[PDB]
Amino acid sequence: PALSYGGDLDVTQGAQTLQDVLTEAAKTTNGLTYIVNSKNELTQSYAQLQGDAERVLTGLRALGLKAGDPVFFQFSSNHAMVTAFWACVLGGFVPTLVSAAPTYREMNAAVKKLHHAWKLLEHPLILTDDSLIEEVQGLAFLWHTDQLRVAAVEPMLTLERDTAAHPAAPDDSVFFILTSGGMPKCVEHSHRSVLANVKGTVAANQFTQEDVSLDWMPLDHIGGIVMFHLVNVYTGCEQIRARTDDFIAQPLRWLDWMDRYRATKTWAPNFAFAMINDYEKEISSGSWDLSAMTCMINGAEAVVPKTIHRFLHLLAPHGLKGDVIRPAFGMSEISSAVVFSFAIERGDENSGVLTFEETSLTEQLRPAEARETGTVSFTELGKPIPGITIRIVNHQHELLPEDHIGRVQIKGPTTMKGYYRNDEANQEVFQADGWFHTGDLGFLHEGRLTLTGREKDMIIINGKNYHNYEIEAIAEEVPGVETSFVAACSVLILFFTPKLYEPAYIMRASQHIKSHIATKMGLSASRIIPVQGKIERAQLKTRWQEGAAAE
């Protein structure tokens, strides 16, 4: 059946709280390195991190924070954010990991979302940088409130160390983290759930203390805080941090950093690999030594086969091995990645990729050879990590067999406590028998997960759900329609290329399109809409990942 178990996981072994993790890390000689520019870096050993955290703890406790209070993080500096996080860990405070607003001058979507979480958490202290504190204080005017409370981190490092750490229990809440989506929800995790993912991820990837980590993704992203940062401290390995805006400005800096620091592992969503591919001209005029890289995780969004293979091809002359890319899938609600694929290879472009007939997406998937049209290719995302169970169910939540697209559900010890102060939302995701409803769509093959879409993308008609490729099919049925792409809109849109570019030929195929779909479906004819000088090397989906990501 479409049910895959990652194997047993000894969660009783190793550290049980994040305070133990920092202690075992403070005993090593490794630590963190913060990149500031091409010729400057700030270092902070794990032993030094522990000390700095105790100093900020003195400050936080001096502002009235008590064990269990939430703290609203608004940081631009990696050094301050990492230290604030571990100060809260020592004091038992609960950080709220959310990104900083693009601008604090005007009322934008980001500022409204910050207000929602700030109000939901009952006006917690906002912890900030010296660089950002000037902007964050402007929220008092945008929010029209007198309860705003802000404080910077740098002045707190000049205090003595408070070595009286609040004794934490595994089930205690460790931090909040905001999702993407309307208003964002507030995911609440515990020491036990985050550590279960760390321990499962270390076992699956064979991470060790000898790794050298490089990450420029935000720490307010679950993959930045758990999959990498906390994994790095749990293994005690060396980790290097860079600012996200520095990569977006000059993507090739990712290659400089990997070479500069001889990094062995890094990650990014698919758009970052595509951004690098756009620099093929300068990549062929540069020089990098990437022979140390062994793990390039690709996750957080759809992993495009053409993207990762062009990536491996461009960087081969610079020493990048052909098996370093590891597609992965995860969510904030399950404390980051729960599957990793180790099948991508430069030579064999079909390894770790599955191609099927488009006509089989609604039934048992029919394998097929890649073709100019009529087929679809998906990147396999791998088996579940130890301790995780994945299954695929239909719209009645019944178990499906493999090679059938369905609703992805997760069961394991990495699952959140739940959305904060939203019993209703928790009921929708927490199904009976301990299954978490991801909202994603995919299938299982040989125990390996592959995502194909999201419930959010389905279209409801007559009180029943349908896929965009189901509607597109009835349109291709119409004579004179070569191919078609649909896009549901709010006051149905159907693009189609005609077999013959001739007016009355195009007008008749357009009529039968608006009519045939209007009769195969119980919808008004008016609702359906048929429609009919430069070349771009970048893929269409990949170019949308870049625009959405940069903005």
Ligand SMILES: CC(C)CC(=O)C(=O)OP(=O)(O)OC[C@H]1O[C@@H](n2cnc3c(N)ncnc32)[C@H](O)[C@@H]1O
């Ligand atoms: C690798 C992980 C650290 C990613 C993660 O943990 C995160 O992305 O946290 P987030 O809660 O913000 O979003 C979760 C939503 O991202 C989507 N998603 C993630 N990985 C994907 C993939 N490999 N292919 C297609 N979609 C993917 C999915 O819809 C999911 O439900």
